[PDB]
């Protein structure tokens, strides 16, 4: 195997039933409105990815680089965000209720974790 490095391939495999996309290199991927719920994206590079409206429910995004990702209106409910880098992510309208984080998750500056519904882990 190899880490996935293209949208086409990610989406082809995901509908093939694959869910391990550990270490995916998708740093500038256009993933607007995709449904990849339940995928393992831990350690992925999504640093300038367009994830607007994406369904990321129940995904494992631990250690992922989402530092300047566009997550507007994305669904992250139940996702694992421990040690993820969301430092300058656009989280407007994103749904984070019951997503899990830890002391090492880097959220944006004014981001209200309580109102967002985050859980510690």
- DSSP states of the chain: ------HHHHHHHHHTT--B-TT-B-TT-B-TT-B-TT-B-TT-B-TT-B-TT-B-TT-B-TT-B-TT-B-TT-B-TT-B-TT-B-TT-B-TT-B-TT-EE-TT-B--TT--HHHHT-EE-
Residues with Cβ within 8 Å of residue 32, at least 6 apart in sequence: 50, 51, 52, 53, 54
* CA-wise closest residue to 97 among 72, 73, 114, 85: 114
Query: Given CA atoms 75, 117, 61, 15 in this order, what sign does their dihedral have?
Result: negative
Q: Distances from the Cα of 84 to the Cαs of 9, 38, 59, 63, 80, in angstroms?
A: 24, 17, 12, 4, 9
* Distance, CA of 63 to CA of 25 (rounded, Å): 13
- Technique employed here was X-ray
Q: Distances from the Cα of 82 to the Cαs of 6, 9, 64, 102, 117, in angstroms?
A: 25, 26, 9, 5, 15
Instruction: Give this entry's resolution in angstroms.
Output: 1.7
* Distance, CA of 47 to CA of 41 (rounded, Å): 13
- Six-digit token string for 94: 């994103």
Q: Are 9 and 28 in contact (CB under 8 A)?
A: no
- Six-digit token string for 27: 């740093």
- Six-digit token string for 110: 């004014």
């Amino acid at each position: 195997q190899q880490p996935i490095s293209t949208v086409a391939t990610l989406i082809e495999m995901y509908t093939a039933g694959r869910r391990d996309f550990n270490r995916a290199e998708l740093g500038d991927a256009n993933l607007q409105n995709v449904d990849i719920k339940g995928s393992d994206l831990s350690y992925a590079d999504l640093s300038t990815a367009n994830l607007r409206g994406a369904n990321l429910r129940g995904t494992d995004l631990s250690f992922a680089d989402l530092s300047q990702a566009d997550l507007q209106d994305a669904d992250l409910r139940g996702a694992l965000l421990m040690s993820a880098n969301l430092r300058q992510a656009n989280l407007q309208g994103a749904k984070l209720e019951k997503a899990d984080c830890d002391r090492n998750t880097h959220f944006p500056e004014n981001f209200d974790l309580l109102k967002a519904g985050l859980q510690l882990k």
